[PDB]
């Protein structure tokens, strides 16, 4: 149906506030051809916004994470002991 | 016809993940439902992601891996136990089967792991069939020297028993065990190409011969 | 390194990946025919290796020339067993064509017989090329090449070009073999097994690449022309197909 | 595989350069992960360096040297230009370099002795005498490329033959692109210092499953014994007196497991073992007013591991001999050469500013001269100037108590050893050579002139310790025989798999005796070959046999005699009875105990320390070497181009036949 479509999309969008950007990614991938191609639903109004603000929310995690990963990969040998206490794996030969 | 390839494609991808792990990592050389799925989508993803990062010698911090594993185990828990996309439904069931089959390769002895498989087939799709198909091929790509002939002859043997089991229920039309036909052709063909065809290939390959 | 690996892989599995990707992977029924052909080739290789194992452990591994003679005899009996189980797979497909058509399907033709010839030949080709070259391709990822003990440095490339020719020869031999088995023509049935014996024997001159690689591609071109005219093609059909 | 045998020839008899770590620096060598690959070019002159540094068409080379060109200057030239040198294989020269070679520093064990800016500042950084005058410091540098030692001549001939086959240059042109190459694997898991490495090894062993330990402290056991047995479960009385005879037990070199150490280590503890077995055979040994402790320190090269651990355990009450009980101290240094029958007596000048300490040291030297007046083949001398003390184990004891100590040595100024801490300090350095018509069982019992030279020093040392222990009556019976000296020299320098080492060790320890000589490096392996062989040699040379069965020998508690707190018991193998294999095992009732030698900066867990020798060894995996041919990048681009072309042409032809298959194949 379509009543349990938006009522399942909002449970994907309200679940990405628990540090889940991949839930927002599968919200974008799955509910895209049902929100921008065919105008048929009365409840098509809010299926077009829940996939738009969740693409704003997913791109927000891209800007933070790809900055933090490069900042860690550069500033890890410059940091001293602290770069070792918050490193999951440390490469062997290189400092 | 279509429903046979719908059982070939999941059992092919589950073996590609295991064989690419055995040949590259070199380390493996609702109370009962949800709780025993939190111990695989979080406790085994934490080990499998961490062991493949050691192979390539790359630095990863805790706040990214704790963000990555949580974005794998929570979406995996909300796609299996609750509604989700079908392409993502089957893909996680491939991924949890390969992780559950890789712990049946490391923590077993050499001649003892064939005992379990043997007995199982002797007294024998569902998630149980994806595991023990993958254990057979991962065990074949581990014991011995470098021999890609033995790994890829056990890949064909499972796909034949999976083909004949679906063909056997065209007359009977009843739930079958599926295991004791593919594992029987796996127990034969592993011990028949590892030491009987493998010397015949090496003499032909030393003089560069082609049959 | 990576360049030699990804160069010799695309020579050996260049035609075979193209045929599987464009022709076979669409129909869900042809993949079953492919895996069954690979299975019967595995059974042929196993039954051929049993005889060589028994001979090499009866003759006690004493003389050096007698081991070479047993090697030649094992290659010959392996060729003969491959060409026997090809006929076995033809008989199984002919038995399974009367059951798939006109008894479990209304329309009497879900798949023709020339297509099963093509897919059986390609299945033999793919599994024989996998057992020919995949162990050689793993050594191409190292830094070194062959020739520290006075060998040729063109080992990997020539193994790739031999594997590709073996794949194409099996793909052509399947078509010619099944059309020979249909029309009860047995002079061509000897020519297919004779060409298999010939292309297996020409790899006994194999360190001399000038005469062990060019007659194999000569046989490959002639067998491709005969599998083309065998399946129904002609110059009347080529030159009136360019609209 | 049958194809990799056509590609690679492994290199079998090699020895790598290994990274070791300090509190502030790293030393040693390292490769990249998955090895370093280079084109072989041999070097026999100074024009062959220009081919590697400037004139090479194929820039990442991997050069091959004779070890007479392994000089500090050529290492500076290879280190200044690092992007063109990846690898270095050094070949062992059998005519040893006549100018000498020592890769250690100009002044060994610098900031871990007594002399500093607060105690002896005129003698602080050995301002008077450079002890290792031929030292060029090369073993304490850091290299970015591997350095392997080639020990076999046949492998060097194979590499040079492949060079002559493939890598030459005809008529002043480029070499033809199928070229021979070599790949060296030595990847070290450790980093900047031992603080970083110990921290990184403690984090991964606490916060991480499957712990990645990437260092190991250098550690072994000291081996000591008593002349008269002590209680060992308590401490001695404050009015007990011991006389300590100490000697180092180890050595190193530039390359990892190679450490022959003949002049610097082996002859010194061989002559202390001979002096111990000479002193034990005195008829008045039980009624001596004082006692004698023989001690063999291990770790003395890496800034006094064992001696500092002994002093630290001795001043924390954890050792049964206390530091107050030490009365006299006779250190035994390098005594092997003795160029004019002279044995110099080195003393410490700064502690002798105290008047009673000076009187005790003068009385010690008078006792030494009185006990050496009975041996005409040893001329005991003392240095003319008030010169400082050589680097020795007495310098750790002089940081705590100012004991009256002396150091015996063959030198007055710099070392007579031309090969201090080097690969050439073998049995030919101290002239332990045997005639060729003797069986190796008869070479065990042939007496070298070096054995007769060292037995005299052992006799002087034994009579001196007998006089320091208040003996004074049976002073003529104490005399070392050269038989035990030549057996110990043959065992430690020629062949460890004797008929005499087998009959003194245990059944469990028979794999510690290889076919060649023992190497004397303090390994990560917590007991070493050498520590066991010295312990059981001291057990036979000082202990007696008792009638006990093996069940009584493993547990001597139920025996009414044969106390366990005083002695130690071992069930050893025996000699062979003829025409069968009859080891005849028995108990040895000796005092040869072991004490742990791990430096106290590792027990106190201060891995950035300036007084307790924070030396660690990197952990690694897969040390191997191999030679092969390489193909040009032209051929690699040609085979990748042909692969892409065959793939694209196959896809185009397949799609053009498949799309028109309705028209091409009519019925
Ligand atoms: C851990 O282990 C490492 C490995 O050995 C130790 O590193 C060594 O530490 C030594 C400390 O004394 C270093 O020696 C000093 O080097 C200084 C730098 O000199 C340069 O080197 C060349 C070499 O020929 C000299 O000609 C030039 O002058 C350069 O400047 C020297 O300044 C210093 O010599 C001084 O001389 C003046 C003269 O009046 C004295 O007043 C002064 O007291 C001092 O003697 C000295 O030679 C050594 O280079 C260094 N090795 C390496 C490879 O870096 C660590 O110290 C160890 N860490 C510990 C024990 O905590
Ligand atoms: C279907 C046919 C698949 C053929 C795959 C051939 C791979 C090969 O030749 O090299 C693998 C190569 C090399 O294999 P290898 O056998 O040379 O590796 C061991 C040898 N040493 C230790 C010297 C390296 O594997 C890898 O590099 C590891 C990563 C990839 C693993 C394979 C992935 C695909 C698995 C099957 C799906
Ligand atoms: C080139 C010629 C030789 C190879 C092809 C031989 C014929 C294959 C075949 O079965 O064709 C008939 C088949 C079947 O033809 P058909 O469908 O007309 O058969 C008759 C069917 N009834 C009776 C119902 C009318 O053709 C196909 O459409 C299947 C194969 C198509 C793709 C073939 C590609 C071959 C490429 C080989 C060279 C690759 C180089 C790289
Ligand atoms: C190092 O030892 C290996 C043995 O493992 C040697 O390899 C053998 O070499 C001989 C002579 O060429 C061959 O007949 C054998 O077939 C080789 N055995 C193998 C490859 O397993 C190797 O030659 C030695 N390397 C050197 C430099 O002497
Ligand atoms: C060892 O002897 C030296 C010299 O006799 C002692 O050094 C003296 O220490 C006292 C007080 O600590 C001061 O008079 C001077 O610092 C030193 N006098 C000198 C050098 O003439 C040293 O304390 C003694 N003990 C130890 C443990 O080293
Ligand atoms: C020191 O002892 C070790 C331990 O027994 C010896 O190592 C063994 O050496 C033999 C002979 O090469 C090998 O077959 C064993 O595999 C080695 N065992 C281990 C655990 O490494 C070593 O040879 C001894 N050192 C010397 C110089 O004799
Ligand atoms: C040390 O020497 C003993 C003999 O003195 C060696 O023992 C022999 O080893 C060979 C080879 O394995 C056996 O065939 C003999 O039976 C052994 N016993 C004898 C001759 O009595 C031992 O292998 C040597 N150890 C090393 C490391 O070389
Ligand atoms: C130390 O080892 C040597 C090994 O030869 C022992 O010498 C032999 O000992 C037996 C008694 O067990 C005597 O019968 C032989 O005559 C001795 N051979 C000699 C002296 O060449 C020696 O006894 C051992 N030391 C002790 C104290 O038992
Ligand atoms: C061992 C190999 C190399 C032998 C090759 C023999 C070749 C040249 C021979 C033998 C079989 C022959 C074919 C047999 C039958 C036909 C069908 C006919 O309507 C046209 C000619 C054609 C197509 C022949 C062409 C020539 C041919 C392909
Ligand atoms: C390698 C050394 C020891 C022996 C060399 C023997 C050579 C000259 C012999 C032995 C095997 C022989 C081959 C055996 C079988 C065939 C197939 C036949 O249809 C054509 C001749 C051909 C191809 C032979 C050519 C000559 C041959 C290659
Ligand atoms: C060094 C000279 C004097 C003698 C040896 C010449 C060798 C290296 C040459 C001469 C003939 C050559 C072959 C000729 C034809 C082919 C077929 C082609 O598809 C791949 C390369 C290959 C297989 C060549 C490889 C190299 C080759 C074998
Ligand atoms: C028998 C003997 O003594 N061997 C040699 C001797 O030839 C040499 O003169 C001496 C150097 O002092 O080294 C030793
Ligand atoms: C080196 O080769 C020669 C000639 O084959 C041989 O006699 C000698 O024993 C070899 N050396 C070693 C250490 O094996
Ligand atoms: C010291 O020796 C006595 C013997 O009188 C013994 O009883 C005791 O256990 C020993 N050890 C001590 C006091 O630690
Ligand atoms: C000299 O040494 C004796 C004995 O060690 C000690 O009692 C005395 O105090 C020392 N002299 C000085 C000035 O410290
Ligand atoms: C030997 O000398 C000691 C003095 O230390 C003396 O007590 C003892 O009686 C002497 N023995 C003989 C036999 O003269
Ligand atoms: C020594 O022990 C043996 C057996 O253990 C015994 O027969 C013998 O009498 C003992 N000798 C003495 C003197 O106690």
Author numbering:
A (entry chain D): 7 to 101
B (entry chain B): 85 to 113, 169 to 263, 362 to 448
C (entry chain C): 2 to 244
D (entry chain A): 34 to 700
Task: Tell me, in the authors' exact words, what the paper reports.
APP is initially cleaved by β-secretase to generate a carboxyl-terminal, 99 residue-containing fragment, known as APP-C99, which then undergoes sequential cleavages by γ-secretase, releasing the APP intracellular domain (AICD) and β-amyloid peptides (Aβ) in various lengths. There are mainly two isoforms of presenilin, PS1/PS2, and three isoforms of APH-1, APH-1aL/aS/b, in human. MRK-560 is a selective inhibitor with higher potency for Presenilin 1 (PS1) than for PS2, the two isoforms of the catalytic subunit of γ-secretase, although the underlying mechanism remains elusive. Here we report the cryo-electron microscopy (cryo-EM) structures of PS1 and PS2-containing γ-secretase complexes with and without MRK-560 at overall resolutions of 2.9-3.4 Å.
The 3D EM reconstructions of the PS1- and PS2 complexes treated with MRK-560, short as PS1M and PS2M, were determined at the averaged resolutions of 2.9 Å and 3.0 Å, respectively. PS2M adopts a nearly identical conformation with the apo complex, lacking the characteristic anti-parallel β-sheet and the extension of TM6a. Among the MRK-560 binding residues in PS1, only Thr281 and Leu282 are not conserved in PS2; the corresponding loci are replaced by Pro287 and Ile288 in PS2. In contrast, AICD produced by the PS2-complex can still be detected even in the presence of 10 μM MRK-560.
